Design a binder for these strands. Structure first.
Ligand SMILES: O=C1O[C@H]([C@@H](O)CO)C(O)=C1O
Ligand SMILES: [Fe+2]
Length: 858
DNA sequence: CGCGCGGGA
DNA sequence: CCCGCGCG
């Protein structure tokens, strides 16, 4: 029973209830952004507003609650309606919150019962130098109660489901309400500038007679000198104003052992007057869903008003398409306050757009399911498998005779012997080409493979997986592995634990996992994970088409490619890649940053969009933007350089991994292609110089990431191993080692290194950072793709002029103003569902893996 | 090159 | 708050 709750609630009082529970037969925590973390991380009770829980129910991450009908009598009926998705109770209600009318008793002993009285009161109070009303007009959450009083709704509700095609923005009731709000602004009774902080400051300072706020504000008003009351929201045209109602709710996740135990704790250890009172003592709960305790609290007039307005209002829809509703209505109110549209114009356009975006979002969810379940172009067959197995077994004989003749196995000039683990190694730089791995210096006996990872012995199995997964490693000279998926997830967590435990660095616990990693230096390998058919981390569709594997242990499982290590023979391609890194470094095109605190120093290039730079309106880091304008030879030179670097590396990988192009084609949108680096799935490229990196999962990158290494100057490197602790392996990069791995789902790092001589190990990742490609596809939509270079040229000149006239603080004013315009442009395209990549709508990230292949052997 | 300013949130 | 940016 580990219960999550938001940090700003009463956790210590809940801990009291849980102590009183643990006795008769637990740990409450406050993780940052719980509402984003819980959606990704479920694969435990959770305390959060019901509106997210509807999305968790479409996501199946919440246990159906089965409360007794006598228990359901203990709480209010509308609270249970807030937690029932598709006719199934998704959680237990706790608290009820909604906006109320807050008023200063010394200016206003009798607050107005109707909105229509307010204009008359403002006249009088303006004569005294004060005002009738000040509330946040910037967010529709606050303005909607007035708008919807006379009719008008978000999405129509019937049969326990919201019709996303039936929006109520344009209804006559909504038109009258928005009209009354704008009339108040025109007569200077309110000013369309008024935000949360302004209105809060003006009320708590006695400068206005009323504001509109929820219970969170009560705590702040209590510190002021204001004698205030809290009452029902004014009626509009004799109608109750309808504030949205949020029910703080406790839910149980479908990935939980303790389900009937947790159900017992919630029913008769917290949802009691004793338990809710202990929490209310810690932090104020507001109104309560339990009828017994709500009658106690409502003795407080402020609490009675909160439940009053909550019952007079509408329960906030728990569907994700409410985001569309919110963006369209936010724009309608803003425009109709600033006279940028008529009330009737702004509500008509918001009705249209909100319904449009709700439609596209449901369409996008179904398109995403096809992405996740997509299959590689079928090249597997039993005949193909057999003929490929003959070719592989033959290449194994050819490779064995080549090893007898040469006296050992070799990667470039480096002696490969998997009996030894290479702890330090020497590189020679005989000439101006890349430094070459020549000698193993320090070693230990090579630790065995961990029990969850198996080397595939059969050439037939090697062929099965090669054809079905789109992997063709160097024939006769590779090792394929199979990793159980449950144990892979266990070990990923064990590795993150060790890193945390060490102080977010390489320390003893990370070193302990490393000591049991097996060396695959010099080797070319692929690790396939296998998912047993349920009868969590990864999401294979077991309804997909099934192949008959030759090995029975695959039957009833799905396979996917989590990691592959390549050894690139030095030649034309390594010359091209290394030359581009040298060109970009020499030309000052890398943006030096610190990563993971001060874990390491990385250099970045590629098609970033650093929104933090306000003048940034085109692809590239800020040096790139400048180079296109200031060059006196060719403005696109660095872009040609970046495209060739990404395409040469991509091509090298593609030859061995035929699924990579398939993945690129599957996840990059038409709108995203111009902002990828050439015809690859790479938009950002890193570069490290002799850096270790701590063990981590990359969360906001693509499905598969590429890392490559190369060397300059002679010397000796100790440490610097690349480690994949959940696959139970590590390796020293040699002449030109590349790893392609699923970084969303595979913990990885790089041990610290110590060097002798001038030797430099250059590490570089080629990855897909989806935020930059999405924002750039959005900028392209709003302004035109080919117009961004011209806009970026104008913004650089405008800022440089400002600096050279009025000082740097003028220049900063200009940059911040450009950021707001860029931001608004992006937000509009974002609201129209413009994306550069396809993303999981549930997780807000790219899928965990792709191209799952189901195997069955009847 | 250390450090303030800065954006999205 | 983080695989930026530009100023002293
Ligand atoms: O461990 C790592 O090494 C590379 C680094 O050399 C380039 O950034 C990187 O991406 C890490 O995840
Ligand atoms: Fe990484």
């Amino acid at each position: 029973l580990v219960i999550w709750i938001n940090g700003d609630k009463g956790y210590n009082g809940l801990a009291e209830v849980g102590k009183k529970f643990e006795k008769d037969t637990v740990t409450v925590e406050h993780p940052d952004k719980l509402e984003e973390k819980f959606p990704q991380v479920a694969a435990d009770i959770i305390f959060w507003a019901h509106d997210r829980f509807g999305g968790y129910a479409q996501s199946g991450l919440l246990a159906e609650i089965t409360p007794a009908a006598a228990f359901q009598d203990k709480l209010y009926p509308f609270t249970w309606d807030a937690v029932r998705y598709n006719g199934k109770l998704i959680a237990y209600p706790i608290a009820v919150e909604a906006l109320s009318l807050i008023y200063n008793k010394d200016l206003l002993p009798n607050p107005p019962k109707t909105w229509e009285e307010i204009p008359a009161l403002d006249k009088e109070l303006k004569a005294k130098g004060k005002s009738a009303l000040m509330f946040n007009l910037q967010e529709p959450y606050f303005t909607w109660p007035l708008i919807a009083a006379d009719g008008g709704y978000a999405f129509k509700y019937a049969a326990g489901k919201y019709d996303i095609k039936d929006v109520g923005v344009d209804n006559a009731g909504a038109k009258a309400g928005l009209t009354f709000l704008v009339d108040l602004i025109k007569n200077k009774h309110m000013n369309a500038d008024t935000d949360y902080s302004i209105a809060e400051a003006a009320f708590n300072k006695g400068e206005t007679a009323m504001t509109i706020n929820g219970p969170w504000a009560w705590s702040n008003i209590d510190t002021s000198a204001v004698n205030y009351g809290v009452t029902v929201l004014p009626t509009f045209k004799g109608q109750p104003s309808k504030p949205f109602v949020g029910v703080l709710s406790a839910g149980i996740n479908a990935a939980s052992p303790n389900k009937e135990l947790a159900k017992e704790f919630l029913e008769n250890y917290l949802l009691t007057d004793e338990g809710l009172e202990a929490v209310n003592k810690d932090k104020p709960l507001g109104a309560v869903a339990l009828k017994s305790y709500e009658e106690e609290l409502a003795k407080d007039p402020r609490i009675a008003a909160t439940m009053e307005n909550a019952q007079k209002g509408e329960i906030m829809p728990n569907i994700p398409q409410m985001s569309a509703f919110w963006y369209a209505v936010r724009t309608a109110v803003i425009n109709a306050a600033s006279g940028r549209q008529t009330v009737d114009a702004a509500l008509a356009a918001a009705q249209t757009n909100a319904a449009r975006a709700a439609a596209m979002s449901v369409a996008l969810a179904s398109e995403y399911q096809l992405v996740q379940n997509a299959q590689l172009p079928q090249r597997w067959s039993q005949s193909a498998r057999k003929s490929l197995a003959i070719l592989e077994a033959t290449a194994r004989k050819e490779a064995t005779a080549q090893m007898e003749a040469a006296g050992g196995s070799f990667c470039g000039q480096f002696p490969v012997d998997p009996a030894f683990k290479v702890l330090s190694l020497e590189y020679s730089a005989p000439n101006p080409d890349i430094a070459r791995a020549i000698r193993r210096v320090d070693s230990v006996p090579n630790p065995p493979l961990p029990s969850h990872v198996v080397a595939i012995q059969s050439t037939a199995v090697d062929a099965d997986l090669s054809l079905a997964m789109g992997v063709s490693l160097t024939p006769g000279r590779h090792t394929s592995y199979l990793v159980d998926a449950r144990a892979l997830q266990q070990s990923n967590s064990a590795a993150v634990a060790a890193r945390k435990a060490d102080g977010d660095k390489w320390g003893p616990a990370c070193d302990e996992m490393f000591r049991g990693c097996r060396c695959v230096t010099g080797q070319e390998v692929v690790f396939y994970t296998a998912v047993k058919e349920p009868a969590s981390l990864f999401k294979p569709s077991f309804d997909g088409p099934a192949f008959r594997p030759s090995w029975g242990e695959l039957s009833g499982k799905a396979t996917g490619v989590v990691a592959c290590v390549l050894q690139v023979p030095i030649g034309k391609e390594t010359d091209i890649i290394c030359a581009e890194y040298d060109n970009l470094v020499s030309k000052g095109q890398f943006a030096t940053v610190d990563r993971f605190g001060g874990d390491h120093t990385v250099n970045m290039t590629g098609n970033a969009l650093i929104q933090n730079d306000g003048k940034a309106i085109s692809k590239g880091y800020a040096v790139a933007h400048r180079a296109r304008v200031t060059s006196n030879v060719y403005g696109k030179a660095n872009d040609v350089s970046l495209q060739r670097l990404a395409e040469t590396v991509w091509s090298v990988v593609e030859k061995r991994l035929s699924f990579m192009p398939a993945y690129r084609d599957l996840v990059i949108t038409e709108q995203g292609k111009p902002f990828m680096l050439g015809a690859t799935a790479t938009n950002i490229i890193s570069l490290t110089e002799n850096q270790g990196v701590m063990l981590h999962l990359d969360t906001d990158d693509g499905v598969w990431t590429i890392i490559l290494w190369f060397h300059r100057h002679s010397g000796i490197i100790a440490g610097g191993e690349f480690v994949l602790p959940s696959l139970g392996i590590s390796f020293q990069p040699l002449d030109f080692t590349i790893v392609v791995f699923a970084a969303n789902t595979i913990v990885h790092g790089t041990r610290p290194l110590q060097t002798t001589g001038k030797i430099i190990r250059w590490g570089s990742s080629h990855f897909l950072r989806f935020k930059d490609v999405n924002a750039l596809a959005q900028l392209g939509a709003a302004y035109g793709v080919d117009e961004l270079d011209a806009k970026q040229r104008d913004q650089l000149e405008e800022v440089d002029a400002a600096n050279s006239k009025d000082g740097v603080g003028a220049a900063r004013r200009v940059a911040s103003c450009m950021a707001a315009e860029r931001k608004a442009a992006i937000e509009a395209q974002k609201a129209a569902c413009v994306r550069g990549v396809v993303m999981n709508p549930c997780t807000g990230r790219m899928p965990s893996l792709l191209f799952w292949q189901v195997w069955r052997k009847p």
